[PDB]
């Protein structure tokens, strides 16, 4: 590993099982916390209610596009109290 | 009976714009192709040129089963009753133009 977009697709799968279907609030304030803004998140949320497409897939790959590490995904999975997720992406290191 | 060489352009064209069109329950050419005993790859590298139904007929002509009634009985068998009806007459016709003619000797 190294970058978000270099996560093995199952690892990303298990991790888009969390954040995805995970409390319209518990997620929404992870997203708003991804250095994003009002208008942008309006797009990336719309995507939810279309033929099963991981809103966190899209949020994650789009943070990929912006050169996000994986240590930054880990970081903000604790500084947001969503350990439930990082539990999996430490089964990798 | 006789080889596809019998039926030409006129119907090959019609015939085409029936089976060229990929359907979900019905038989598109690929279904047919299958029955005329064609391998996997053969079918796919045929799913390329426009008008593969024609490109199918002409690949399965210098071939064993190559009859016209053979294709005919196939179509009937694949439940494409629609084709042998807006086309049936037009074929036992292009079989005449070939039986009567090319037989002046």
């Amino acid at each position: 590993a190294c970058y978000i977009y270099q996560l093995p697709s199952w690892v990303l799968d298990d991790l888009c099982r969390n954040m995805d279907a995970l409390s319209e609030w518990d997620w929404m304030e992870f997203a708003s916390y991804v250095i994003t803004d009002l208008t942008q998140l309006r797009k990336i949320k719309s995507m939810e209610w279309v033929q099963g497409v991981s809103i966190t897939r899209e949020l994650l790959w789009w943070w990929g596009m912006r050169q996000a590490t994986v240590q930054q995904l880990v970081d903000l999975l604790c500084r947001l109290e969503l350990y439930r997720a990082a539990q999996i992406i430490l089964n990798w290191k | 009976m006789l080889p596809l060489a019998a039926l030409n352009m006129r119907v090959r064209r019609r015939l085409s714009l029936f089976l060229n069109v990929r359907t979900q329950v019905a038989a598109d050419w690929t279904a047919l192709a299958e029955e005329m005993d064609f391998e996997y790859l053969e079918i796919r590298q045929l799913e390329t040129q426009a008008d593969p139904t024609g490109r199918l007929l002409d690949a399965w002509q210098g071939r064993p089963g190559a009859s016209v009634g053979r294709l005919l009985e196939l179509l009937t068998k694949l439940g494409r009753d629609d084709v042998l009806l807006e086309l049936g007459p037009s074929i036992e016709e292009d079989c005449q133009k070939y039986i009567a003619a090319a037989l002046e000797h």
Binding site: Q51 | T23, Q24, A26, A27, D81, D82, L85
Partner: protein, 107 residues
């Protein structure tokens, strides 16, 4: 052709009008109710649980599965009759009226 009658062929239908009686059957899973109502002569379901799913996936492409089904069940000649007689019988009176304003009762 022009004078649409309960004797003409489905697959013979203008591609302008199909994209039109599409908008009736298309929304509210209307065609699903149609799809299963289509039965071969034996009596058995024409399209089954599986075929249905196929059509469903043509929403991701943006194609009237009314059409893709309509054309597709056209490959058995089925009269425009067969269509309304199956439109009425399934309560699709507004489309069946567009076809032929004959057998279209009034609630």
């Amino acid at each position: 052709m022009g004078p649409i009658t309960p004797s003409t062929y489905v697959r013979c239908l203008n591609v302008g009008l199909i994209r039109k009686l599409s908008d009736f059957i298309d929304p509210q899973e209307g065609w699903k109710k149609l799809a299963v109502a289509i039965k071969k002569p034996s009596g058995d379901d024409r399209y089954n649980q599986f075929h249905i799913r196929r059509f469903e996936a043509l929403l991701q492409t943006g194609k009237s599965p009314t059409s893709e089904l309509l054309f597709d069940w056209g490959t058995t000649n089925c009269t425009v009759g067969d269509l309304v007689d199956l439109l009425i019988q399934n309560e699709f009176f507004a489309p069946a009226s567009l076809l032929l304003p004959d057998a279209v009762p009034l609630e």
